[PDB]
Structures are given as structure tokens and as C-alpha cells.
Amino acid sequence: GIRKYKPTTPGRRGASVSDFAEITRSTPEKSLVRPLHGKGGRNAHGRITTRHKGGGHKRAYRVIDFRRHDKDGVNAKVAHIEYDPNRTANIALLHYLDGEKRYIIAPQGLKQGDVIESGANADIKPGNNLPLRNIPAGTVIHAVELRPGGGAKLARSAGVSIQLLGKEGTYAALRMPSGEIRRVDVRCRATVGEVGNAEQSNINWGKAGRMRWKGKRPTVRGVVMNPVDHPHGGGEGKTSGGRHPVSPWGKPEGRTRKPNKPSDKLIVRRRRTGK
Amino acid sequence: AKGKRTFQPNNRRRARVHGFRLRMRTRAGRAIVANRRSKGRRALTA
RNA sequence: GAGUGAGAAUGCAGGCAUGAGUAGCGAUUAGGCAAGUGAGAACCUUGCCCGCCGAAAGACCAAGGGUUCCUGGGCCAGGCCAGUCCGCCCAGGGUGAGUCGGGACCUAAGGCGAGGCCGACAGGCGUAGUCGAUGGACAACGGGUUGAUAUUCCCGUACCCGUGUAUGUGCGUCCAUGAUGAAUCUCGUUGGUAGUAGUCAAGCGAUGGGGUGACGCAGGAAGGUAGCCGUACCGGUCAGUGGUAAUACCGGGGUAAGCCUGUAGGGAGUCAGAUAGGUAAAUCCGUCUGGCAUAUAUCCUGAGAGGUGAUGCAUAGCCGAGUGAGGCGAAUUCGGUGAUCCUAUGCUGCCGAGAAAAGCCUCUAGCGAGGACAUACACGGCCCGUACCCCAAACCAACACAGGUGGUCAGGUAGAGAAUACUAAGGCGUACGAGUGAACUAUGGUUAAGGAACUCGGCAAAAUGCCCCCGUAACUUCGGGAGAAGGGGGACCCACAUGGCGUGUAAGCCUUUACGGCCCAAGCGUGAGUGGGUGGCACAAACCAGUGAGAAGCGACUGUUUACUAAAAACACAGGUCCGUGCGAAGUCGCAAGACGAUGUAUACGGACUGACGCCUGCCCGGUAGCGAAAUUCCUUGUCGGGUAAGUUCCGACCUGCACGAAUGGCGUAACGACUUCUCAACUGUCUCAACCAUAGACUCGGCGAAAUUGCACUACGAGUAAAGAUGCUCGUUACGCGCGGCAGGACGAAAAGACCCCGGGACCUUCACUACAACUUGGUAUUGGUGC
RNA sequence: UCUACCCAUGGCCAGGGUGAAGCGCGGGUAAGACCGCGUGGAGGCCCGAACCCACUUAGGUUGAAGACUGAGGGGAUGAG
RNA sequence: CUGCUGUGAAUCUGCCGGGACCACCCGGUAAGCCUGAAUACUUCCCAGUGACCGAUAGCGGAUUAGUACCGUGAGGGAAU
């Protein structure tokens, strides 16, 4: 849910926070926690390769089970649902009956004590993870793999999900959270259900302080920058650049995807751009 | 005021930024050491 | 044969002048006297007195410095003066660690990285590793001592690994000593070999694994302790004053780690069976399955109190051995107050969700007929730093420089306080002085009568200022505005008051007999109220300490910004929209590998632009077609008023005609603002209009002692003339020579080879200027087989 | 070693104030939004030191200082 | 003559050069080839020379000289 702050301060006026109502613990699993230090958006060269990144609250990585293949036929119980700093959705600490503990992206509607199944024989219920070959068509899945055994990569953000439109041969058509139609091998695994925490997109962060906590540094506009700094830089007043939009490196707006990619043949219908 | 001068001494940092090991690390620094040795510097480096 | 001739190059070097015996002699504390030393003393020593700091200007750590430390000498350099002195000069001495801070122990960011991958070469990355504290682990505290070191040395008492001895053999051996199924008949059983043979049984025992071991921010409350204030008691003073002989006053009224105990607080179910999930194995962890109680039970952790340590140590004081080194040495009780410290990595809340090594179990394995375990003896178990300075004269600042420099401790009285004032300890008077009522400058102070009339502008100053009672508007996003505004009181003494409150002596409560609870005389602290009275001009009497109100614009807001003239309306921002990106994504850094993005995945990332929040559709949004209302102020809108006596900013109606500018970029918008502008109340030396006082300069004397500038010089004025603005030229006028203190009209004064303007060149920026290059398609190379065609 | 930004690991922020949800209710109420009294202690919250800054003014301007001082001023639990 | 890219020759009736080609011709026998001494320079050492300098010259350096000093550093760099 969402808890809206009262306007006791100018920085809290329209602000809201996650109503952490699905969270069952305030701490992670110490065995599954890993160190995670900030980068500032800087690569191995020390250069800022991604701007507007830095500061931000310290985070600890929770090892997520995106490649859910080892526990094939071994059931788990939803031990807890926990906050994860490193993703918009909540994580679900599972207790595999064999005695192993792992984190997964907490799907929508998952509660503590629920039983989760993995493998072809798993029931089609939220949290269960079985290959697309065994997931029936016209169902809402998430945490879908791109290649068999490669680990979940698609629709793992809070509230997102993929529609398994159909299966033909050794491929399955998926409608992505972006509306794109893409084929992926049926041997790719996917967890059933949506991703939980769907309301998090409605969080109003209220003040610059919240985004500085989240690690987002302020964004300066090119039309404000000088001509040397940005192509939009200059003009007596906040211009629009004197021309159509371009990036700080001069790249104009337009499809930036590289052609001749091997996935061009897998992608059926790309996303609908403002229709 | 803000009367901080440019030079803030630090022996460890001096050694780690201009020291003999750092100079010998790169060919350019080795070149600097050799050039100082040819010039006759008593202090080839920090 | 020339390195052959200088006066110019804002030339170069060295030595000097001119200003000049001139400025200055470096804060906002302050010195004085007596004596000493000495050739010489404002400055050094000693004794007083005075003054300054006292959340430091006291005492330490760290960095940095590097001997500056101590002793003895020196005084021609330095010290802004002098100097006998010194951080200066010279010699000698001085730095003592199992425990402190580091290494020998860990790792974070990051560095380097065997191989390796990538790259024409150079090299770029990077795995394994290995470094890398600012963090983790890790054993010591009091007292004394030196001229200089001290958790280091010494004293006392503590805590971390080994060798020779003794206590037990806690179990097993060459035997015996327990557990296990050891076996026959589309299977069967016990009917043998065969409960023998093997395994575990010992005593111990990872580098290897496997698992616990491990962190945020805020907020109290409680219990303590340090500290502080008293007090029993103890030891002393009479400080030439009116009183004051113990009733008064002054000093003490101390003592650590360790060890013992285990209190307040905090956290905890426990015992079996199974299990490969933790790569193998585990008895460990995890999961599941059960049994029992969830209790004033038990177990961990744990401030503190108490005991010991402590018959020691230390201490007020005592006498005299002034080499002043010595000895002797009392009391030490209770209370109040009380931490920013401890319990506490606790507890509670919250979202922004908070870094491995040792430690402890487990096992595979291992030594081993014993070897090993614990206990008690006597004996042993590294390197580096350690002086000294460390808000400073020893560091960064060229200087003994008004600047900067992280952390720790944080007495008293007022006080909310770490503000502020004054003070304790402690440390200083800090390095030019003495004088002198000049102007003038600066910093303070006061000011009649006015009270913003000053001025671009209330700049500056002045003013409000605190606590408690009341009481608080428009508007609002319902949070605010707000401490709105406005009003009253505040001191001291007495009584209520042997009060109320907080603490807590005993007796009893139950009793588990406790480090127990409740109450509680007394004692000690202590708020506020009421009623009287007292004094003054004044009771937040000092210091400290909001001015407030109304408006207009801009920007929602807190925040950021041109280090060094711009802090803003600019940037940012939360919200919004658009575009890109289906994932070693896009986008960036790279030749590439690779990296960030992100250990993220369209509720996510990047980019662009807006910049909270609210509003912005008219016949058909089937037609002229984007609407014609309104909030829309260029408005020059005049007209009128409001506001001033004259009133800018601005506020209103009437205004303005296809208008005009915003179907999303224009209008509003509470709050906020060192933003811009204005009007008020108050206030004032801003002003009418200035006067006086003090201090630092200025001035005088003594010492030291520059500077920019300088073609010259016994350098007037007038009217002229001149490169058109003359001390230097003309004709006259004036003027004895030389200073000193002032003023700033000229010397087209100094300063900077004008930034303006032009010309020549440059640089950087823009682009549909030219030409190139980085960044994508075509042909064939890599690469290529048939058939259905 | 200045400075801009970022990363790791530490530290600091005197004092005072205001008072953001769940308990019990008078309630509102069929029931709810929600008013009030207590508790709680949030906030790029308020006043205000240290600390950081640098708005105004005066002085400095061959300075004490190649950017400072005095007096005021801003932030002062945070984007510190 | 030669780099890269593609395509790609026989054996002397061959192939290459003579700044196309019949060739009159001439010269030579690449790619698989490989391999020698006899000319430039002076850190350093020895002996010398100068119509070279002679302490602001001559080396930056006759002297503590790449020292003092300056700079974080590369580096700059004296005077005597």
C-alpha cells in the first residue's frame, strides 16, 4: 500500500511512502546478504559513465534466486517477505523443504507460509516457477528467462508482468511489460504471477532529499548548460536548444537499437510508442 | 575564514603519489627517474 | 682576426642613492613596583601587586615539523627595538613497552596484479592472489621517580604462549573390557561358514572445508556512575578596620586495573526422530516431524552497589637539614545534585533498509598403545614510534603572519545552555616603548528639540529582544501564517510553609530471608501560587537576547552557484510530459577487451524539456476549423480616484475591438526568501547640525627602519605662446633661506606597454562557411553443401 | 595534498521549542471520513551555540592577511 | 621498390628489367634462400692543441652545484 505523508513540512506535502504492509521482517537473511558498495555511476576507468548517480544510502545485496533450476520438485514455504533496497519489488525468503533458504522476487498476492513449487510438475499459482513448456498459454508470469538456464531477466520490476500469449514449436510468444511481443525458447523458466509491490510507482518522493537518499544526483538541463558543455547550451534564456532534442554528446532523438542483432528475429512486434 | 593553503603535507600521500615505487611503476616515471639521475639530482623522487 | 666601442631596449646583473631617518614596528589583555644579575635591563630572573583567557589564550591525541626537548655555555647574525633572554648559536645529554599506536593479525574503497583477455608497438583491463585503515580482533591499571622518558623506568597489584617437575589414566592397549545386520533355498529362513572376522571404544585432533560469529538513522524513558555542591569528622586563621575566639572563616573530608559477587536493564524455549539442502562427510547449521512448559523456571549478557586490591599508595597539615632535601602525617562519614559518560551493538520507532578475520561447533581427516587432557609448582615468550611543539612563534601560511588545522577532557556562580559575564585549576601580559586633551582617520560611548526632513536606498546606527500569564488577523495546501499582532506581571523580605514536590533514617511487609519491595520521621535539595510589606528612576536592572505590520513582482518550498566584485529572479529540486532501451539493453568511458548502467530488467534505466499545488472543451470538437469566456496585463488607460502637502512601487472601477497572449504555457497560489520594490508603527546623530569623552593611529622623544617613484632642479603666479591645457618659453606680478604639522588643486601625479575604439594576430564558441576526420549502408574475404526452388 | 564530484571507513552537531499514526473513550457514528483529551516523538521542522557558509556594512586596500578583521547575517538532523 | 585487401602464373620456347607492346634486341635469373671485413658516433680513459673564455666570461656549476633555494610534482635553479 501507500501511506501519504501529512504536509507538516514543505518537503512532505504531497509526499508518500510505501506502506510496508507485505513486509514480514525488518532484516534480511545474513547468509544470503552480500556486500554492495556504491559506484557513483563511474566505470573501471573512474570516469562518470552514468551521470546523476552517487551519494545514496548504503545498501546490502540480497542474493536472489533468478536461476531457479536446482530445486526442481523441492517445495518451499514462504518464510518471510522483506524489503529489498536493490529493487522496487519486495523479496520473498523461501524455506525449501530440503533445508535451503533463498530469495525470490515476491509476486503479487504472495503471503507468508505459502507453498512454492519449482519444475514442470509445479502448479500454476503465483510464485511457482516452471518452464514455459509447462506454463499454459494466456497466463500472467514474471521473472522470465531469455535463454534456457540464463536466469530471470524479464519483468522483475514491481507490479510488472508478462502475458504468455502462446507457444509454437520450441518458442513461446510473450507480451512484455512494455507491450512488445517477443519469442523466447520454451525451455526458459518463468515464475507464475505478477510482481508484487505494484503500488510503489505511486510513491511521491516529496523532496530532493528522498532522491538523494535513493542515490539520484541532480540533473542539470542542457539549455542551461553552456554551448561548450551541451549542444542545447546557450541562448538568452532557457531555450529548447535551437533545434530538436539531442543528448549531451550530440545524438538526436530516434531509435538507438543496433540493427542486425540476433534477437531481431525473436522479437515479433516491438513496443507501441505513444499510439 | 577559509585560509586553507594549497599544500597540506602528508608523508604517506607524498610517497604514494610521487614516490620511488610509483615512479618506477610506469615507463614515464622510470624515464623521469633516469632523467633526474642523469641531471645529477640527489633526490631522484619523493 | 674581431665576442672592437651603449645612454637608452618599462634591457640583464652587482653596488648604491630618492622618498627618509620617513611609513611601519602585526590586534581587539596591561602592565607596575622592589630586589637580583649584568658592561649594558621597559623587555631576563625572583617576590609581590594588577590585568587577560578560562568550551581556552587550560590539559592531551593525530597530522605535520625534526631535536626546536633538557643541562651548561654565547650574545656582532635572527627576534620588527634592546636583550644578560630566546623556538636563535655551540657542546653534551635526553625518547626504555609482551599490554599504549602500528607491523608480525584481518580485511573496505582503491592500488598492483602470476597466468590471462584485449591492443600494430607503447600499453588497457583483469582472475587467482597480494597489499591497502580512516574500520574489526587483540593482554594493565594506580602511585612514585628524572634536568630532560614513562600505561615503557621503579613500587604495588594485574592480565596474554613455552620448558623440567608432581596430582590424578578422565578411556584404550598384545589380552579382556560396549554398539552394530554379518549372511543359503518369482522372494522367504536363520538351518551352518558368521554375533567370529571388521568398524567404531582410546587420549586427544584444521591450513581443508560446512555453519553461527556481523554493523543504519532518530527518540526517549529508567537505572547508574564520573563530576559537582554541602555535611559528620579532622587540621588550622585571627588576615593591625565597627563586630568577629569558634558560633566565624580557611584547608582536607582521597586511592585504579585486576579478582570476588552477579544487582538494575536487555536477550533467550528446550529435548528427541528424520533429512543430504550447506559441493564430500557431519552429531554442526538449516528444514520438517513430534514430546514437555511457556513459569515470580533456567541460561547468557550486564551498568553499577558492595568486598578485596589497600596494614600499601596518596593527601590537608606538621617541624625544621634552604643542597631544601628530608622525614612525620589526622579525618575520610553521610546526603543533595548530576552528565553529552555507562547499561546500550540495549530498547522503541522509522525507511532511505544499513563493509570480513578471529571466536565457537561440525566433520571428514590426523598422531597414536598409549599419547594426550586438566590442575599445581619452578623457571623463559619480537620490530617500529615514544623527546619536544601541536588553534601554534616549532604544522599549512615566503614572516616569531589578526588567516587555516581533525579528535579528547569540559570545575564554580548566574544561565536552558558547550551562549554570555565573572571566576577555580592551569596558562598568559605575545617581543618596540615612553609621552601627549592638535587636526584628521578608525573603533567604541553620550546627546537638547525634531525624528528619515538623510540617501539611489532607513546604508549605518537606533530599536524589539528573556520567562510566565493572557490574547492573536487576512489568507491557507488545514500543516500553517504564529513568537502574528496586542496586553499584564517579573526585584527583595515576611506568612501561608514543620506547606506541596523530589529524594530518600528507622520500624514494620511479605517473607524466597534478599544486592528485595511499599511507606517514611529526619536531613538535603526545590518549583510555582496567593496575601501582605520593603527600595529605587529603573526588578528579563549587567552580559545575553525576534523589530513588527501591510503590499507588489520573482522563484513553490529546504538546498546549490561565479574560491577572489554577481547568492539572485540564476542552478537544483519534488511532480509532469516526450523520446530511447527486451538486456554483456539503450546511453556513456575505451582502439579493443572490458567497465558503469546494474549484481538493476518498461512500476527499470538513459536522455530531453518543464519545474510543487490548482484552473484552463466553445452547437457538431457529424464541420470551417479551434471559438469569440475568463484571471490578461504591453495597457503608453489616458478619465477618475486611494495612498503624499507634494506618492514612486502599487491598488481599484471606467478603460480600451475583429486582438492577442497563454486549448498547455499562461494565470492564480498558503508557506518559504540575507531576492527586487514600496507604505506604515517604533526607533533613532541618516539628517536639521553638529558637540563632547575615551581608545588605536596621527603628533613629540628614544631604538630599529622600508616602499612605490625618480631625466634633471636654488621646481612661483598671471595673461599669453607652444604638439592647441607650461614650475622650465614670452612679457610682467609676486616671492628673504630652511624646516615642521596639515589639505589634496596641479605636477595631463603613481600604479597596470588602455580592458573601450580601430588595425594585425590569437584563442575559444556557433553554423544550412570550406575542407577533413571520428561515428553507418553496398561488393566481394572470412564463406559455404545440395536439394524443394 | 587546493578545488569539483564520487567511493570506503570514522567522527561531530550545546541548549530550547513545536508536536506527524496506533490505544481508551465524549464522540462522530448502522458503519465510516474525522473533532478533542492522553501517549509517541516525525520532520531536507522552528529558535539558537560549536561547526559550515558568506547577505550587509565599516575597516583593510605598499593590509595583520596575494581575499582578511569587527559588527551584524544564513544553515545549524541534513541534499548537513 | 613497397604495405594491406582480393584474385592468382612452370621449370628456360620459363620469368623479370630497360619508365606500354610484335618483338630487332640487350641485361639479369626474384620469389625457399641465407651469409663477410673495410664507413658514422664518444658516456668513459690517455696524451695533446687553441690569433678560445678568464670569475656578470667560460659548462648551470673555478666556490655546498644540479648544491642552496623554489615547486605537490614533472621540473626550474643560483650566488660565492
Contact status, residue A22 vs residue A106, Cβ threshold 8 Å: yes
A38 vs A61: CA distance, rounded Å: 11
- Angstrom distances, CA of residue A89 to CA of A2, A45, A162: 14, 32, 15
- At residue A258's C-alpha, the angle toward residues A262 and A250, to 5°, is 170
Diameter of chain A measured on Cα atoms = 69
Helix (H, G, I), strand (E, B) or coil at A101: strand
Q: Name residue, grid cell 533545434.
A: A243
How many angstroms is the resolution?
2.6
C1'-nearest nucleotide to the CA of A203: C603
Q: Which fold has domain B1-46?
A: Helix Hairpins (1.10.287)
Beta-sheet strands, E only, within chain A:
2-4, 16-18, 33-34, 61-62, 76-82, 91-96, 101-105, 115-116, 129-131, 139-142, 144-145, 152-154, 162-168, 171-175, 181-185, 189-192, 267-269
The SS3 of residue A192 is strand
Q: Residue A20: CB partners within 8 Å, gap ≥ 6?
A: A83
Task: Please check whether residue A164 is in contact with residue A139, taking contact to mean a CB–CB distance below 8 angstroms.
Answer: yes
Angstrom distance, B12 CA to C258 C1': 39
> Quick check: B45 CB within 7 A of strand E?
yes
List the one residue out of A224, A220, A252 whose CA is nearest residue A239: A224
> How far in angstroms lies nucleotide C552's C1' from the CA of residue A232?
35
CATH class of A196-275: few secondary structures
d(CA A25, CA A106): 13
Residue (of A131, A153, A157) closest to A144 by Cα position: A153
Residues with Cβ within 8 Å of A238's Cβ and at least 6 positions away in sequence, in order, are A221, A223, A224
CA distance A80 to A91: 8
CA distance A191 to A118: 9
| Segment (H or E) for B11 | helix B11-18
d(CA A46, CA A48): 7
Residue with cell 641531471: B39
- Nucleotide with C1' nearest the B33 CA: E74
CA distance A135 to A190: 8
Q: Which nucleotide is nearest to B7 (CA to C1')?
A: D1
DSSP at A145: E
**Rounded-to-integer distance, Cα A2 and Cα A15, Å:** 10
| CB contact set of A23 (below 8 Å; sequence gap of 6+) | A81, A82, A83, A90
* Beta carbons within 10 angstroms of residue A265's beta carbon: 8
Q: What is the DSSP string of A146-190?
A: SSTTS-EEES-STT--EEEEEEETTEEEEE-TTS-EEEEETTSEE
Question: What is the location of CATH 4.10.950.10 in chain A?
Answer: 196-275
Phi, psi dihedrals of residue A213, rounded to the nearest 5°: -60, -40
Centroid of chain to Cα A80: 20
Category of A169 on φ-ψ map: left (φ > 0), alpha (ψ -120 to 50) or beta: left
Strand partners, A139: A164
Contact yes or no for A25/A95 (Cβ under 8 A)? no
Tell me the C-alpha to C-alpha distance, in Å, between residue A10 and each of A14, A206, A207.
9, 9, 8
Does domain A1-114 correspond to CATH entry 2.40.128.120?
Answer: no
Q: How far apart are CA A79 and CA B18, in angstroms?
A: 56
Cα separation, A120 vs A134, in Å, equals 6
Q: CA–C1' span, A55 to C738, in Å? A: 78
